[model samples]
Target chain A: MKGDTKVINYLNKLLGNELVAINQFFLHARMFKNWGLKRLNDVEYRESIDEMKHADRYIERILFLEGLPNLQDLGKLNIGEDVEEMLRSDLALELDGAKNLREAIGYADSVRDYVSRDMMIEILRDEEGHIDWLETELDLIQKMGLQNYLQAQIRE
Target chain B: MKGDTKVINYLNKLLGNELVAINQFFLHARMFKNWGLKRLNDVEYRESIDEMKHADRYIERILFLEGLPNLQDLGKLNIGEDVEEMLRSDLALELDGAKNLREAIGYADSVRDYVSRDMMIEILRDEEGHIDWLETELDLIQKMGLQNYLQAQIRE
Candidate 1:
């Protein structure tokens, strides 16, 4: 019942990334809240929830395919030095993840792993939204001062 | 299109608690991993994921009822000073959350909020399992010293 080794390995790698993302997003959200950045805080908080959903889907697929959950190696977490830095780092991460998912879709297609392919496609679409939002935010941050944005959008 | 105000308010309160739980669980998992206690780390990590699922369900239900998701006031997080304290705190938190959900069910029923009632019931069932597992872990930690139990169950 096990899935193809290549698919299993790829999934396991992505699982690690998702684990790191879930924690990183939570931490960033808390930091944003502490700084009175409610808008950013909500975004990061929802990002964590989204990553958790993606991870759960990965877990279910792996289990159904008879692959054991690795549950280790949480991948890299880039907290960055400040809010702007964090946003930029997050954008980079999301873009990279999107790229990886695109490649994963191809791998899933190669072996005719239709189930895995479908899973990746669904997740890939979400990742694209994340990447788009992140890129837009990064551009906005570059054009405007971080403090100005935060001050304007500070929690009521 | 709108649901009962009482039901929406009740769901909002529970959503706040879920937000807090997700963050608290993520933080605790990282702490455990840092302490080289991967067994406990994975336990908390999985717990956070479960809470996220519950939160998503709550969100969808609220949206279906034509209510705007309130993204404020995440409830308190109790990350204790140490592992044993964390375990005890988590046990208390789960117990209290279960009690609150029980009340929430009664509130939903009183207003004939069957949809929200079912949602709370589903989450309550999961919370009950969490409470039981936490109590069991606390008992185990007391019977076999925290250091001893973690040492024996430590990951490589």
Candidate 2:
């Protein structure tokens, strides 16, 4: 599985593309900024910071493989009508992105790129959780209007 | 402030340009699978993540100084929608990031690392805001998306 050329190129490209994209994404993630709710919770906030670190570890390895980052394809992100909507769009992007990557994971296994295959498995885990996190947050925003939530905050 | 001569010189050479390509992007962020915080969401997780982004700025400088990095020293990133946007983004980001970085100043000033001094001043003010930014997120996770706020539903 480790020496197959067809799979190697596929997995290599998949892994390489993903690493560069993920690294770039995490590095600039702060740019997205929080809106509506005004900010994030302590635990989520802390995790957001950690996500970049996680990206770095993968980037370091992608570089090892001489993989070039494909920034052009990171996604066509729309700012959305507001932060909450923007966030929902982001959630959709993440989910869709994960779905594609998961397919790539299967390809990695097919090519016998064990290292990369293992890496994808590891990544899939986080991807699943990231989607879960976004879903829960989306649920909250849906339950309460942004202004209403703020007003409630004041009353409490 | 616009072009921090010392900081910019380092950033230009240390962390941008062609060299960044070989660098992986998204996959590493995927490493959260192995971490404890993988259980949290964006804000629930980004406290340290933002700090690390600030550190990358310094790391870029170091790499440039050593002549190991590929980009020009302090070269500006060609990101964002346009030139003004890029600069504004940089300013806001640096300022906000330094808000968190400033906290280390007292300790940084006391240290023996000469390079640390320039890095500290350039990045300090931004650090303070980073903490402030984190504080802003304290209660904001629910709005990011439900997935971004919950524990992973994965049985494993």
Candidate 3:
């Protein structure tokens, strides 16, 4: 059975949000690299790659449901000026993504699309992990000096 | 019958190269964004997405052939300090990638793997296009002031 327009619309919105997250994480990875935070750079870059996978997952699901992905609605791109601010922005992005994906899962459930619902549930796990990592990093940076925290990361 | 070890090794090398390209292009995309070149940023970011697809393709192929991907063999990760240098670096990277992909196609053909051969040809087209864009942009930045080129780009 084809997915309802309501579910397709919600997926498109999630797709848009994924695109924004992809761009933000990709940019932040570079910013961290330029600041000499190699470990953080690797982490953020991998997260952006994950977002790419999520975007691909959504696009494939939408297409499988005979719906077109609306890329024009890419929600927002956020970048921060410093380490602390960037971490905070990333945390916010992940939290927002989690909430949005949760809603998308509900929409999928309403339409009885188990595949879409399952994908969202799996992606939600990744988003939650991202939130956890960012929050811990943010907390560490706040507790320890940024330089000290970063140096410790690089050493490890 | 399985693919020869030689073929599997070649694909793994290509996989490594792709992993590096994905990281480098992603970082360069952010650099372009921070420089206020929206068009360039979008293009580079999309190209990085393409790289992600390429990586996934290779990984899937390797796994199907029962071969392990050696990420430790990642070719190189190159980034530059300025727009001009970054463009130059990217051009070099693309040119190198084109050469490597061309060789990989030859290896695929040697193994009589038409699927892998065809995929390399398609990816080569994208690599060539990236080279063309980076070369043209580099030449323009040299002839026109960087500021003027960037302003024209943003205005467009």
What are the fnat scores of the candidates, in the order listed?
A: 0.00, 0.04, 0.00
Expressed as tens digits, the lDDT of each residue in A1-156 for candidate 3 is 477888888787776667667656644665566557888888988887788788778767776776754434332344555688788988887888799899989878887888889998998998898899999999899899887887787653
DockQ of each: 0.03, 0.04, 0.02
TM-scores of chain A in all candidate models: 0.92, 0.64, 0.91
Off by over 4 Å in 1: B1-156
| DockQ of candidate model 3 | 0.02
Clashing pairs in 3: none
Q: State the lDDT of candidate 2 residue by residue for A68-114, as single tens digits.
A: 22223332224344446645755765676577667867876775666
Listed for every candidate in order, the interface RMSD values in angstroms are: 13.2, 13.5, 17.0
Per-model TM against the reference: 0.53, 0.41, 0.51
Candidate 1 CAPRI grade? incorrect
> CA lDDT, every prediction?
0.74, 0.44, 0.73
Task: Report the lDDT tens digits of candidate 2 across residue range B106-143.
Answer: 44445434465566665455445544653433334435
Q: Of models 2 and 3, which has the larger TM-score?
A: 3
Q: What lDDT tens digits, residue by residue, belong to model 1 across residues A33-125?
A: 656778888888777778888887776677678674454434335566577888887887887777878888899999999999999899888
- What is the two-chain DockQ of model 1? 0.03
Scanning candidate 3 chain A in windows of ten residues, the lowest lDDT window is: A69-78
Best by DockQ: 2
Inter-residue clash pairs, candidate 1: none
